Symmetry: D2
Subunit: 456 residues, 4 copies
């Protein structure tokens, strides 16, 4: 209905190139049919992740010239701190070099073994850090989130009856915290409504339960709220973002997503004692409370980017660029998760590869075939990424078996999207040629980053 | 492909203001309805010129960090010198801060007063430096080049009969040189064939006449040759460039055009004694022969960009992006100069606004309307820019009353082109509503730069 | 020459300023009398640490423009990898965001709880990661390293008899590894001889014991070998470095020291299995095996800086600039650790404050006093940094109770060193006025980074 | 005997080669014993000029990432405009790519055939543009300026009697303007007093005569005023600069000197009519009035740097670093121009090599020897640069036969100065071994840059 032009100009460029199909085939076999193991120079359009692949602005790069590299008390730390305090409203901030650094801190601090962490689906590293510290993870997202072809708004919402049932069955004091993610990545980058955030806050508060947001794509989320939730039409993105976090006790953020940077994240909290504990731990893994495993210039760039993300036209274009790709795939009949989310289009590999069972890793193989036929790199987001259940030793078997076409922010154009859509539409015409995979090498956790496979 | 995807990704972005229509209207009126008085900060898409507005590459910006700022013997100078010798095949090079710096040097070195300089049309600064040093300019472009709507290939070609005629009516000894421009800006960015460059070289050499290229858009020109001149389909852009200059005795270059930089130019020649004399003169106006009024980093950026310009996919996309805008305008019935040239689309503001007389400044108001409706700045290239006749006091009346949509290299997308086209097309549907202008402040010189207007 | 000029020019600058004494006193109080808690903007000359505070080169800032920010397979990773393979000679490399990220990995991978890690003294984070994974740390440095005034060469050498005794008493199978640090920071930056490294490799290999170097100041170390170990005087820094690591099974390194960067580190090993295991773990804490919690641009800068550090004139100047500062203090009677080490001058606070006992934290108070009187920040390196013995709950009581005047690489001049020395000399004249401190806030590990104190 | 520490620390370094003496001799030979022909890569300490060789700040480099490269109405133009209007107090500013571009403009604008332009000595390019436009030059500096060893304050002052004399003999209507330079370069960097600027303005104003400054080293000049002129002890650098230009009708500025940039200049004036004419001409030679042959980023850097220059500690250190080298040379008995100027030390090569006559080029040979012995490049500033008087074909015979040790701003340390001094002193102690030179290649004009020599 609307695909706006880029609300910015190109200031500098990076060359892209395609290698022949025959070379891509060798590369893909070299990589054990795992797109995560391919090499950057062999990729033409790199949709592996929107993590840390974003284009910075001229103002960010100006800040990159103004790094105060002091070991302690860098002025760039104070700019970051004031910016996050202003925009998110949390009392305290601890920088980390990226998101999983903050998850490591939060999980060590806030989980006793045997407690439960509940959330609206999960991100791989987030769940791993919860479980590594002794938590049992419980999925409390609404059922609709797991239905790929279901086109409803705010699919990321928590089901308050699931949360209430967990409380009734396990007791509030045995829930370490709720991890509320905005947006919800596995559902396709699906937003959570303000009404749901408020409802979750009221119920958890009544039971003394803490709520930490996974804030990684919170600006994308705020845009969906402005666009679709009644009563927010006229509120600014910044106001919506500030209200969202008013319903939380803290957050983990990978700045490498919505803060428009190549590195960076942080942990926020309102509680003073937790803040003191977090500082005692940040020095073990990351660095000082005033740099957290980041150079000063990166704290600067992250401060500037988070503020830039609040510009309405930027985030509207960001999200509608993704929608353009998904709209084009859907109009051609390629099966995708719906509605399109904020950061990626998720192909529905279960439908794309109906000739394979999920045990033959259709998402992983489709990702491989897309690179072979198009030079586009995408991510597996199904049974491989979901990992092994620690308790049963068997695959987690998510209902969503998808391939993620993940869009870095401010990097590509609509013409690049057309390339991506065309090549996937042409692969769809011979989708029965996609072969099942088996493991030849499986890491003990987060296996999808470096596992190797062979064709069945 | 008609319209290829960009053969690069965005490395960094330039922040723009997405100023709405009501505010653009206020800004346009405060500019005296003169786009030259607009502030850059208030412009979304700036098509005033392709000069010095290009986006550099990551490699060029790496070069910007390696500026050897020494007054003499800079490594960056030696890199520029080697690059230009390699790619253009001239013996000697003298850097200048931009094209008209080299034009100053060439016209002082190579023109004895009274001599003739003949070229395929002309450019403002180039002709001015010729005439300033006593030359008489003669236009030897083919008659077709002055027919704005005639769509023929290699429209910038010289008419060899005109050059022969000049030689017989004036004598070769009285011709300082032939100024062969590639492309021809005033015809709309029209290319010159290799066959024509060969023919021109042959005739002149037979009479001892020198040929200096105005080379500012030589790479665009090279693309047209690869695309459309029989025999060159399989030659690389570099091979075409090197052959082109092999038919010249030297050149003046604005790096600000096809060397993909924001400042920079140079003078090349093969003659040892002209070179000695250029090195004396460059000290007067520009700088040392080893930096030419450029920072070392800029010599570096220009060395790198000129070589990046040789990449086929880059220049193909550069030219086809301009063609896309022009094609889209032409399909909607918008009157343009044809065929579309390499760097810009020229709107025929006379036909656009037939209901206005030339004295009511149709090009100038159309330009103003374009900004109001889209945030796009465009250049009046008609009666206002032609200046006033001071002997008679009436306007100089240009044959071409145009608005120039000049496209910087690697800055904009096809979606920006759609903003431009869509907005001009809507203005075309209501062309009768475009109001004439009248002066309210007219300076005596450079009136295009600071004049102010009110609607009649 | 005893004090060579800088083997480089200044490319860009950062202003320095001093706030008045009365304001510094307030700042010192607000900081709990812990220099680690002061803010950068309040520091005149910041000698807190040489960690990450280095000035990068033009070549490094060129690489900073060439960040390939791909999530997997960045070109910058492969540059780092081949640079470290070339210069250190290890088979495999895993990037980490800095040194303690590498330490986390090594200690988790190579320690069975109950085993011993033996080393020539220790760095705080290194030992903490050893202990938190269940090792007992054993100091096997030669006795002389603990004798502040004893001016002998290669104070950092392991005592082979101490190592053999540990083997005899505890069994080789109960030794997780030997952590051999080059230089040895706590002894004052004291080098290890190539003969010692050889002897250690011969003994350990016969017992099946692995040796991992803490390579963080290995280039400083190499310089001392070149300067003072007979038969190396005309070998290149690079040769020496490569031979040093030929005696190791791997290493941890903080690039923020001798790789001349503001962020960055890595883990190296020769063993194939351990490498596979390291990659399974890097994704939990840091990131992919091909970015390790760094931006692409940072792997690039680190690759470039490590190679720059091999330049003899650079490392000669670096080390002799520290010596200059130590020579000036010593000549004026200020007590220092001797001989001066590679990266810092260590004030002997035991002799500076003979009126205080070590239980009164003379080093912590001397660092506070230096800042208040001069605006120079320096680090406690005594009883506070030594930490708390977790078994008995008592302070570790190091013989060395020192203050570290830590020199960032390529940042300051000899004139700055003169200012530092003059201010400390003047303080020493009223040394009796320095008051003892006591804890008011003690973190549970690594307490020196954020502890707060008050005067006794 | 105050030599302050640098009021900045090193943010980034420039890589340098330090080739040994035997290779420097080889290079010096290949260069024809002319230091202007040496390559930058072969020089350790490059004191050829303070022009465009300065180190910029982090703030300037952040400005470099904020280049608004628009052809008209760039934010960087507006920032430069308001900054110069503010700090110099002129009504109108026209940017130019460097000083001699502005001189071209001023001389074309303000000189009528046959008029006189009188100044306190002259600079090469400034006087050339004056004469080229029909002016007759007249030196009205005080006679003292020409006496090298005369150590008096404000040596650049104009002699009011000579000005009154010129007026009486020639008539004020035949004087185009007084060209007053601050500092006076050819006298050795000698300052002009506020008293003299005031008196010059008074006398000229009495006769309706214009005064235009050469402002290139106006900040250095302001420092001398602050340090030494009674009435200005308590005035800031900025207040002094602003008062200085209040005694002028306009100025030409090379930003490559006291604006702390690598490229840039401008033309200032108060007269509305001359401004309009200057805007007409700037288009011919430089660019639009809105960029003047500069990239937007450079207008930015120059705007930032002019303001930085006003910082007392910066300019105090700048001047006292030059003074340090001069004082060390004079204490060793090396003959120099006195007092030491703002930007350079001038060796008196006449006395240094009193065994040679001027016609044997003692300054040129000394410069050669300085480089061979230290890797310092310096500028011949004597008979060779004076040039031939080609009316007669003989050498011009300046009273000042000098070698200029020209100090770029913020690039070097006092340790570098010691390198320079130590080597020159060693040379001085066997100054008889310096061999005379003779032309083997002389150009007709500007022989300083390309002439080549051999030992007699
Ligand atoms: C063919 C050709 C050129 O195209 C060219 C640059 N073209 C301009 C600049 C420009 C010049 C005057 C007024 C305006 Br309005 C705008 C443009 O905007 O099209 C030059 C000069 O080169 P230079 O600008 O580097 O000195 C020489 N020959
Ligand atoms: C007083 C004063 C100057 O000193 C000056 C430049 N001064 C140089 C450069 C320089 C070096 C060698 C030959 C030449 Br010829 C020139 C120097 O080394 O001292 C200029 C021109 O400014 P510009 O260089 O920006 O055009 C105007 N006035
Ligand atoms: C990417 C991500 C993370 C982890 O962030 P990193 O910076 O990659 O460690 C956590 N949660 C979500 C929802 C993410 O997308
Ligand atoms: C600085 C240091 C470390 C830790 O590295 P970080 O990058 O600070 O985490 C480890 N060992 C030694 C000897 C060090 O000096
Ligand atoms: Cl992922
Ligand atoms: Cl000149
Ligand atoms: Cl420390
Ligand atoms: K520009
Ligand atoms: K740092
Ligand atoms: K990245
Ligand atoms: K320069």
């Amino acid at each position: 209905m609307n695909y706006p032009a880029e609300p910015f100009r190109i200031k500098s460029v990076e060359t892209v190139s395609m290698i022949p199909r025959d070379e891509r085939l060798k590369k893909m076999q070299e990589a054990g049919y795992n797109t995560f193991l391919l090499n950057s120079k062999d990729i033409y359009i790199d949709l592996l992740t929107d993590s840390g692949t974003n284009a910075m602005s001229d103002k960010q790069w100006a800040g990159m010239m103004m790094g105060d590299e002091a070991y302690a008390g860098s002025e760039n730390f104070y700019h970051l701190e004031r910016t996050v305090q202003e925009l998110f409203g949390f009392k305290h901030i601890v920088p980390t070099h990226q998101g999983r650094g903050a998850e490591n801190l939060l999980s060590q601090l806030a989980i006793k073994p045997g407690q439960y962490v509940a959330g609206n689906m999960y991100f791989t590293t987030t769940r791993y850090h919860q479980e590594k510290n002794g938590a049992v993870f419980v999925d409390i997202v609404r059922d609709e989130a797991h239905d790929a072809g279901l086109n409803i708004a705010f699919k990321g919402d928590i089901d308050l009856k699931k949360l209430q049932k967990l409380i009734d069955e396990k007791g509030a004091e045995n829930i370490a915290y709720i991890c509320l993610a905005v947006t919800v990545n596995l559902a396709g980058g699906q937003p959570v409504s303000m009404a749901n955030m408020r409802a979750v806050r009221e119920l958890t508060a009544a039971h003394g339960i803490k709520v930490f947001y996974d804030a990684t794509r919170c600006v994308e989320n705020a845009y969906f709220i402005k666009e679709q939730e009644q009563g927010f039409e006229n509120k600014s993105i910044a106001e919506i973002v500030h209200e969202m976090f008013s319903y939380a006790d803290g957050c983990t953020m990978s700045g490498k997503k919505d803060c428009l940077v190549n590195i960076g994240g942080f942990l926020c909290m309102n509680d003073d004692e937790m803040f003191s504990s977090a500082k005692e731990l940040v020095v073990v893994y990351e660095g000082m409370p005033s740099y957290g495993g980041l150079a000063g210039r990166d704290m600067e760039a992250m401060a500037i980017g988070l503020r830039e993300a609040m510009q309405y036209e930027y985030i509207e274009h960001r999200v509608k660029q993704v929608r353009y790709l998904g709209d084009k795939l859907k109009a051609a009949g390629v099966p995708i998760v719906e509605p399109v989310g904020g950061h990626a289009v998720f192909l529905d590999a279960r439908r794309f590869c109906e000739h394979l069972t999920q045990d033959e890793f259709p998402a992983q193989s489709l990702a491989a075939s897309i690179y072979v036929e198009t030079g586009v790199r995408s991510a597996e987001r199904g049974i491989i990424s979901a990992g092994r259940n620690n308790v049963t030793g068997e695959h987690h078997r998510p209902k969503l078996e998808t391939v993620r076409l993940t869009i870095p922010r401010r990097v590509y154009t609509y013409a690049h999207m057309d390339v991506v859509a065309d090549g996937i539409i042409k692969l769809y015409q011979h989708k029965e040629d996609i072969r099942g995979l088996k493991f030849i090498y499986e890491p003990k956790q987060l296996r999808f980053f470096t596992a190797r496979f062979d064709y069945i």
